[PDB]
Design an enzyme around this catalytic site. Structure first.
Site, short mmCIF file in Angstrom:
data_model
loop_
_atom_site.label_atom_id
_atom_site.label_comp_id
_atom_site.label_asym_id
_atom_site.label_seq_id
_atom_site.Cartn_x
_atom_site.Cartn_y
_atom_site.Cartn_z
N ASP A 1 5.24 1.52 7.51
CA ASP A 1 4.20 0.50 7.44
C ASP A 1 4.41 -0.46 6.27
O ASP A 1 3.46 -0.91 5.62
CB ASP A 1 2.81 1.13 7.40
N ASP B 1 0.84 -1.20 0.00
CA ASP B 1 0.00 0.00 0.00
C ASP B 1 0.87 1.25 0.00
O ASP B 1 0.72 2.14 0.83
CB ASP B 1 -1.00 0.02 1.16
N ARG C 1 0.46 8.98 2.00
CA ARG C 1 0.14 8.91 3.43
C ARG C 1 0.98 7.89 4.18
O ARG C 1 1.05 7.95 5.42
CB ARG C 1 -1.36 8.65 3.66
N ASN C 2 1.64 6.96 3.47
CA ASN C 2 2.51 5.98 4.12
C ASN C 2 3.98 6.32 4.00
O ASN C 2 4.83 5.46 4.25
CB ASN C 2 2.25 4.57 3.60
C1 LIG Z 1 7.83 12.41 16.39
O1 LIG Z 1 8.89 12.80 15.53
C2 LIG Z 1 6.57 13.19 15.95
N1 LIG Z 1 5.78 12.69 15.00
C3 LIG Z 1 4.63 13.45 14.56
N2 LIG Z 1 3.73 12.94 13.55
C4 LIG Z 1 3.78 11.62 13.03
O2 LIG Z 1 2.94 11.27 12.19
N3 LIG Z 1 4.83 10.76 13.49
C5 LIG Z 1 5.01 9.40 13.16
C6 LIG Z 1 3.79 8.53 12.85
C7 LIG Z 1 3.97 7.26 12.59
O3 LIG Z 1 2.82 6.42 12.26
C8 LIG Z 1 1.43 6.92 12.26
C9 LIG Z 1 0.44 5.84 12.64
C10 LIG Z 1 0.92 7.58 10.97
C11 LIG Z 1 0.24 8.71 11.05
CL1 LIG Z 1 -0.13 9.47 12.57
C12 LIG Z 1 -0.26 9.43 9.83
N4 LIG Z 1 -0.02 8.91 8.62
C13 LIG Z 1 0.71 7.67 8.50
C14 LIG Z 1 1.16 7.02 9.60
CL2 LIG Z 1 2.00 5.53 9.32
C15 LIG Z 1 5.38 6.72 12.66
C16 LIG Z 1 5.75 5.25 12.37
N5 LIG Z 1 6.08 4.19 12.17
C17 LIG Z 1 6.47 7.52 12.98
N6 LIG Z 1 6.23 8.91 13.23
C18 LIG Z 1 4.31 14.67 15.13
O4 LIG Z 1 3.14 15.30 14.63
C19 LIG Z 1 3.18 16.73 14.53
C20 LIG Z 1 1.69 17.18 14.26
N7 LIG Z 1 1.41 17.52 13.00
C21 LIG Z 1 2.34 17.20 12.15
C22 LIG Z 1 1.97 17.65 10.73
O5 LIG Z 1 0.75 17.08 10.33
C23 LIG Z 1 -0.24 17.33 11.30
C24 LIG Z 1 0.24 16.98 12.71
C25 LIG Z 1 5.18 15.24 16.19
C26 LIG Z 1 6.25 14.56 16.59
C27 LIG Z 1 7.20 15.08 17.68
N8 LIG Z 1 6.93 16.49 17.96
C28 LIG Z 1 7.63 17.47 17.25
C29 LIG Z 1 7.09 18.87 17.56
N9 LIG Z 1 6.80 19.01 18.85
C30 LIG Z 1 6.61 20.23 19.10
C31 LIG Z 1 5.71 18.31 19.22
C32 LIG Z 1 6.00 16.82 18.92
O6 LIG Z 1 5.41 15.95 19.53
#
Ligand SMILES: *C(=O)c1nc(NC(=O)Nc2cc(O[C@H](C)c3c(Cl)cncc3Cl)c(C#N)cn2)c(OCCN2CCOCC2)cc1CN1CCN(C)CC1=O
Length: 299
Positions: free
Chosen positions: A178, A160, A164-165
């Protein structure tokens, strides 16, 4: 519990769980602080992503998470994939600890960075300059190709691959996420729409959709869809086409149009990735080379 693997086991008391990131078919991911992920710096903090079972978890959910853990152990390290950092298997719930990508997924990264619209009043010398430039978009595509080439060399099929991945780090490094997943390929609801409106069927190669056959060349088809997502700045593929119509259009050989402001080199690569015969699509190694030539020319 499961057996202790000392290569990967990390003490769960060195994790401080933080805000959730998201949920999948089996498992939820939360951000966390880890202390001493590097054993030479045992008090040093880092931010990691922790995958664990949901509260309603079945035996199949657990087996799926264990399988993902084992794939992540064997995959090895690469710059352009989400890498395994450790696991917590003893005396508590199963955690799979991975790199965290601070900018989220590539689709949301691009959508939040579209260039200013014509409705904005000019303010300063860069009013028309959005965050995204052509060489950086090409680099995003090249980095995804390099990660897929690595995964292919380890005999891993994603199944997939989509924007988004792909996750984006604080330094704009693309990391495929993933890839090691049970995806229930013999029971896909092709009409399923996600909570954000995604129709995953739109990334499936025809041999996967019609014949349930997956190879690295079916991931190449998906990469072409991902290229179109990049060059539409996070557009959704086959605009306006519902699943029923998609099936019939694919049987007729329909392909997406060249998007606006996309050079013919990149639309050419998209169309090669969507050749009907899997052997007539480029390999990931060829895509890496083709994208590197463009990237070098424009850098
Ligand atoms: C840590 O670096 C981090 N990560 C994120 N976002 C994020 O998605 N991290 C992530 C997700 C992830 O797998 C998930 C299930 C996922 C998601 Cl949520 C969405 N699409 C696909 C997938 Cl597969 C993996 C794995 N394996 C690894 N990392 C984060 O967020 C920020 C919010 N914002 C980001 C932009 O789009 C909207 C949301 C934040 C952080 C760490 N940080 C950095 C900044 N500080 C201030 C806050 C914080 O927590």
């Amino acid at each position: 519990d499961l057996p202790l693997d000392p290569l990967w086991e990390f003490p769960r008391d060195r994790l401080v769980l933080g805000k959730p990131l998201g949920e999948g078919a089996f498992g939820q991911v939360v951000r966390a602080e880890a202390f001493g992920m590097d054993p030479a710096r045992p008090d040093q903090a880092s931010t990691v992503a922790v995958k664990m079972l949901k509260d309603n978890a079945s035996d199949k959910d657990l087996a799926d998470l264990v399988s993902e853990m084992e794939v992540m152990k064997l995959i090895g390290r690469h710059k352009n994939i989400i890498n395994l950092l450790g696991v917590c298997t003893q005396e508590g719930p199963l955690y799979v600890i991975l790199e965290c990508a601070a900018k989220g997924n590539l689709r949301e990264f691009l959508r939040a960075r579209r260039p200013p619209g014509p409705d904005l009043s000019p303010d300063g010398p860069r009013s028309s300059e959005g965050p995204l430039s052509f060489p950086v978009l090409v680099s995003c595509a090249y980095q995804v190709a390099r990660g897929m080439q690595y995964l292919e060399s380890r005999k891993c099929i994603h199944r997939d691959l989509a924007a988004r991945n792909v996750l984006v780090t604080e330094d704009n490094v693309m990391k495929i996420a993933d890839f090691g997943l049970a995806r229930g390929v013999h029971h896909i609801d092709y009409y399923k729409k996600t909570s954000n409106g995604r129709l995953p069927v739109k990334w499936m190669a025809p041999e996967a959709l019609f014949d349930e056959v997956y190879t690295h060349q079916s991931d190449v088809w998906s990469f072409g869809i991902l290229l179109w997502e990049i060059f539409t700045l996070g557009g959704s593929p086959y605009p306006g086409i519902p699943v029923e119509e998609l099936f019939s259009l694919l049987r007729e050989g329909h392909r997406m149009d060249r998007p606006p402001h996309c050079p013919p080199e990149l639309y050419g690569l998209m169309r090669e990735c969507w050749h009907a015969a899997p052997s007539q699509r480029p390999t990931f190694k060829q895509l890496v080379e083709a994208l590197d030539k463009v990237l070098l020319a424009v850098s």
